Structures are given as structure tokens and as C-alpha cells.
Amino acid sequence: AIKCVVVGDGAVGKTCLLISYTTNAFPGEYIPTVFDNYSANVMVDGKPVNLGLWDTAGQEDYDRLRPLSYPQTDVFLICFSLVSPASFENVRAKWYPEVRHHCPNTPIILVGTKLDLRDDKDTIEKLKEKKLTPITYPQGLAMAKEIGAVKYLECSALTQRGLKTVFDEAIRAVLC
């Protein structure tokens, strides 16, 4: 079973992303808080793989507890919300160096979440209230190259847009 660990700031929507992916439908009105360690049967490139997904929601503020999830990881998804520049910055400041410290050889995919909101008018105006703007694709590709990520991928847990490709690319980044 491939080990895919999801790392990133709270309010990236890690739990939401994983739930939406694994259950094939955005949960809707209520987004669950808990995602148990999951093992799915995924079909990638005509071959069946066994994808084990591990969520880290809650451990974001507890630095000595986090590393316990890292041993034996096959691929990390470092996540940031495309409508939260802070969480983007923390790709550089907090998550990449930590993941690289405990796992220097394990592949890293930079995943931008909440794609559905990057051009959502209300969100953009609200961001502009605090002199901020959503992360654009080139910015994120730059970030991905900087930390030497195997890939940069955007997606939306709501619309499922580009969601399948994230975990397919994880599986592909492990097998090869």
C-alpha cells in the first residue's frame, strides 16, 4: 500500500479534499472534521494500485507530534489554499523544510486547493479588503520549482476539477 501523506496549513481543506476524493462526491452542507486513515483501490494507467491516504488535520500547531506521521511515506502532498496567501507562504516557511528534514528523498507534490474560489468574485473582493490577492498559477509553479516539487497541481474538492489527477500523480510519482 502506497503511503501518501497530506501536509499543509489548517483551512487548506485537506480533510475535505481527501473525503471528496475517496467518496467520489463533495460532502455538501456539512464538511466532516475526521478522516480515518484510508486505504483505497485506485486504477492508474490500466494498472490497479493500492493508495493509502493519511490526513494530518489538527497536528498543524504541534511541531513535535507531526513527524510521527512521516516515516515510510512514499509521497507527500504539500497543500496550500489558492485563496490564502498566508498558507502559500507557509509552503516556504514551514512545511517544505520540515518534510525535507525528515524525508530528504521522498517526492513532494505542491497542491493548490480551493481552485473554485480563485475567481470567485466575493472571495476576491474580501481578499482585496486586506490588500491581498489569490495565488495565480505561475506563482504556484514558481513555488513548486523552488522547493523542487515533482509536480504542481491545482484542484477543487467542491467541483472535483483536477482532483483525480492529484492522487494519480501521487501514485505515478511513487511507482516511478
Partner: peptide
């Protein structure tokens, strides 16, 4: 073909960290 023992052994850390959320 499920989550190996390592994950079950990990599950309390995760769980105690779930309550504040």
C-alpha cells in the same frame, strides 16, 4: 491490503489532536 499496524498504532496521536478541531 489495508492500513498496516503502524497506522493503528499512530491513531491515538491523531485522535487526541482531533478534539480541538
Amino acid at each position: 491490503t489495508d492500513i498496516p499496524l503502524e497506522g493503528y498504532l499512530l491513531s491515538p496521536i491523531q485522535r487526541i489532536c482531533k478534539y480541538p478541531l
